[PDB]
Write an enzyme that holds these catalytic residues in place. Structure first.
Site, short mmCIF file in Angstrom:
data_model
loop_
_atom_site.label_atom_id
_atom_site.label_comp_id
_atom_site.label_asym_id
_atom_site.label_seq_id
_atom_site.Cartn_x
_atom_site.Cartn_y
_atom_site.Cartn_z
N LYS A 153 0.62 -1.40 0.07
CA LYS A 153 -0.10 0.13 -0.12
C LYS A 153 0.88 1.28 0.00
CE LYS A 153 -3.91 -0.09 1.07
NZ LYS A 153 -4.75 -0.73 0.00
N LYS A 154 2.15 1.19 0.40
CA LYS A 154 3.06 2.38 0.54
C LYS A 154 3.29 2.62 -0.91
CE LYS A 154 6.46 4.45 3.26
NZ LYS A 154 6.00 4.28 4.82
#
Ligand SMILES: CC(C)CCC[C@@H](C)[C@H]1CC[C@H]2[C@@H]3CC=C4C[C@@H](OC(=O)CCC(=O)O)CC[C@]4(C)[C@H]3CC[C@]12C
Ligand SMILES: *[C@@H]1O[C@H](CO)[C@@H](O[C@@H]2O[C@H](CO)[C@@H](O)[C@H](O)[C@H]2NC(C)=O)[C@H](O)[C@H]1NC(C)=O
Ligand SMILES: CC(C)CCC[C@@H](C)[C@H]1CC[C@H]2[C@@H]3CC=C4C[C@@H](O)CC[C@]4(C)[C@H]3CC[C@]12C
Ligand SMILES: *[C@@H]1O[C@H](CO)[C@@H](O)[C@H](O)[C@H]1NC(C)=O
Ligand SMILES: *[C@@H]1O[C@H](CO)[C@@H](O)[C@H](O)[C@H]1NC(C)=O
Length: 624
Positions: free
Chosen positions: A186-187
């Protein structure tokens, strides 16, 4: 075989269900699980007074107060104050039973239930770590961890030293790998798409997870992960989320490390604790019976214990990407912070709010100051929270000489710092507007992030920008209008138009001057700014001004020119640690005496008000 050593499970083992259940339910030393359970119980006992809010429970769930609440389920009302000082004591007893081992299943349940009762009670208090603690308690309820280094061992003859199945370690390792790997993914997706130290954390996430699994890498991996998690403290106010992972890592070591650690480092006594010779066969562990006759037939405690791992890990992997099913909770960026393993949005710059109401009987307009009742600010930027706030106000206002009032909001967000855009529709009545968790909301205005040549002039002006000024971009929707009274300090105020047409109006000379695509207009100070949009497409403004008097006053300061952090920094760590211990003792003791008072009440009779006031004052008393 390479598969024999690396990826310890043999490749041929993944051939059938009956082989899989045998593979998952095989004996393993419970030494590591005991230490993890002990440390988790210790941390959960420690954090309850501070983070879960037992010190500040009186100021939040008062009696005789009128406050709107934001529960996940609208029918889950909270209990009174003196019946809510008790569920926290039940939770504390459950956590202590987790830590020691006394009646491990009962203690696990007594800690599990109140935690998930008070977690699904305030959507404004959902973090990334509270979800993790709930999940870990839910896992540890089903996995037996009292088989070694437990008080329950000294009162029984079947849990002194036994064999746990392998799926306990499998589930724990899978859950923590998911935590380390979903956050890293998700980063990536968020950062470079919506567009140093940023890449360091991402590479650490993915590489740490992967390498920490595979054999030779543990020492360097343990070093790196431990360093990262120890440094993340005093840099983020995450609480104890760092310490849970610093203790969740040695569960990726061989499941006998405590037994190998005690042996060396000589001593005088290693016999008080049970001497580590060999574990004892358990009931819930499929053993390799004599193949001459037949193999062991696993029971329900094996087949279910194997199917639970799959049905839990798959669901855990699917959940953080379940955004597209819950659409009503989806505001512009973050829908229902919590089960995502990602960081939130720092409330952008929310600014002006103009809650107004009309009475349903006399048809009169009224103004309310923002956030008059609630305790949080998060109700502002959310479709699921604004409806609850409007409904609570509709319920409560008729006790204030009103009846079925209709409420309208005017929220002028700032997306980054220069795109004031109406997030919520002024014209809709929030109380009677339809809403559903799955169906998309109809009164949230679509984002106009670029949707304009605002990312070119943005730079085309900074070359031509003079000294001390300010330029703001405002995007307006068709069929609405604006107002912003300008002060007596901003000079040379002007508006440039980009898309559509505007109908700028001044209430003084009563001027209604319209504009076309490109027109410079000089507007005075201390006057109305009635700008209307008539084009079917959203507009864009170039509100530019300069504090011309700022130069005059700063020249006066320039004319004159021609004419306890230090104490706390000098002091060493000893007194800072003393102050930390003092404040921790104060909060712990305040919680303890208040809980004792609430426990005395409603068990015995409630005493007179004088004694209540005296003891409440005594509890508040700060030590020294
Ligand atoms: C004479 C009358 C007024 C009695 C009042 C005594 C109180 C001041 C005592 C009673 C209960 C005590 C508490 C009981 C339990 C703990 C747990 C204890 O937990 C720990 O963190 C110690 C173990 C660790 O370091 O992990 C810290 C002290 C504290 C808050 C004690 C602080 C002092 C308290 C509040
Ligand atoms: C200036 O002109 C605008 C037209 O753009 C007027 O706005 C109208 O106001 C009436 C008030 O009842 C509304 O019914 C119309 O729908 C508005 N039109 C638009 C396009 O929004 C505005 O009233 C004028 N100013 C003054 C002082 O009369
Ligand atoms: C005392 C009252 C409120 C009963 C509370 C118990 C219910 C509401 C709680 C107890 C344990 C909770 C579960 C614990 C873990 C998970 C896994 C997660 O990935 C989805 C939610 C889910 C499945 C929870 C749903 C709510 C739940 C079932
Ligand atoms: C009205 O609301 C504002 C913002 O929430 C707050 O600062 C102010 O104190 C409130 N008014 C009163 C009288 O408390
Ligand atoms: C107001 O100040 C701006 C500063 O950039 C300047 O460009 C503009 O000409 C000024 N207008 C008047 C009327 O002084």
């Amino acid at each position: 075989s390479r598969i024999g050593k690396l990826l310890g499970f043999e490749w041929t083992d993944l051939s059938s269900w009956r082989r899989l259940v045998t593979l998952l339910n095989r004996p393993t030393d419970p030494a590591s699980l005991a230490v993890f359970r002990f440390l988790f119980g210790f941390l959960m006992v420690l954090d309850i007074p501070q983070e879960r809010g037992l010190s500040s429970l009186d100021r939040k769930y008062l009696d005789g107060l009128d406050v709107c609440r934001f529960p996940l389920l609208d029918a889950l009302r909270p209990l009174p104050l003196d019946w809510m000082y008790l569920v926290y004591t039940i939770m504390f007893l459950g956590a202590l039973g987790m830590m020691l081992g006394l009646c491990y299943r009962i203690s696990c349940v007594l800690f599990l239930l109140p935690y998930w009762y008070v977690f699904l009670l305030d959507k404004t208090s959902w973090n990334n770590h509270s979800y993790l603690y709930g999940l870990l308690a839910f896992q540890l309820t089903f996995m037996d961890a009292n088989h070694y280094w437990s008080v329950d061992g000294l009162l029984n003859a079947h849990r002194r030293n036994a064999h746990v199945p392998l799926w306990n370690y499998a589930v724990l390792r899978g859950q923590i790998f998911i935590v380390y790997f979903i956050a890293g993914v998700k980063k990536l997706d968020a950062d470079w798409v919506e567009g140093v130290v940023h890449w360091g954390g991402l590479l650490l996430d993915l590489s740490a997870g992967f390498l920490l699994f595979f054999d030779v890498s543990r020492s360097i991996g343990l070093f790196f992960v431990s360093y990262f998690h120890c440094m993340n403290s005093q840099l983020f106010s995450i609480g104890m989320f760092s310490y849970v992972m610093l203790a969740s890592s040695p569960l990726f070591c061989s499941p006998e490390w405590p037994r190998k650690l005690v042996s060396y480092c000589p001593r005088r006594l290693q016999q008080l604790l049970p001497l580590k010779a060999a574990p004892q066969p358990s009931v819930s562990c499929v053993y390799k019976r004599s193949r001459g006759k037949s193999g062991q037939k696993p029971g329900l405690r094996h087949q279910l214990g194997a199917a639970f791992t799959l049905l839990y890990l798959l669901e855990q992997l699917f959940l953080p990407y379940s955004h597209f099913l819950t659409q009503g909770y989806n505001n512009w960026t973050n829908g229902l912070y919590g089960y995502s393993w990602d960081m939130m949005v720092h409330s952008r710059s929310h600014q002006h709010v103009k809650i107004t109401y009309r009475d349903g009987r006399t048809g009169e307009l009224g103004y309310l100051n923002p956030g008059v009742f609630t305790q949080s600010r998060r109700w502002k930027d959310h479709a699921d929270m604004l409806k609850q706030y409007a409904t609570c106000l509709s319920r409560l206002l008729p006790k204030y000489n009103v009846t079925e009032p209709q409420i309208y909001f005017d929220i002028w967000v700032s997306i980054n710092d220069r795109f004031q855009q109406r997030i919520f529709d002024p014209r809709v009545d929030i109380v009677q507007a339809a809403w559903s968790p799955f169906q998309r909301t109809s009164w949230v205005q679509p984002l106009l992030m670029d949707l304009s040549p605002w990312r070119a002039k943005l730079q085309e002006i900074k070359s031509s920008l003079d000294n001390h000024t300010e330029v703001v971009f405002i995007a307006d929707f068709p069929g609405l209008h604006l107002e912003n009274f300008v002060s007596e300090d901003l000079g040379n105020t002007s508006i440039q138009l980009l898309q559509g047409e505007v109908t700028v109006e001044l209430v003084a000379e009563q001027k209604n001057q319209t504009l076309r695509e490109g027109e410079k207009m000089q507007l005075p100070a201390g006057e109305y700014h009635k700008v209307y949009t008539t084009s079917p497409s959203p507009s864009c403004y170039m509100y530019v001004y300069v504090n011309t008097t700022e130069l005059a006053l700063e020249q006066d300061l320039a004319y004159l020119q021609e004419l306890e952090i230090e104490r706390r920094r000098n002091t060493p760590f000893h007194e800072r640690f003393f102050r930390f211990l003092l404040r921790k003792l104060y909060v712990f003791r305040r919680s303890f005496l208040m809980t004792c008072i609430s426990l005395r009440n409603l068990i015995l009779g409630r005493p007179s008000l004088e004694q209540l006031a005296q003891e409440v004052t005594y509890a508040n008393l700060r030590p020294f």
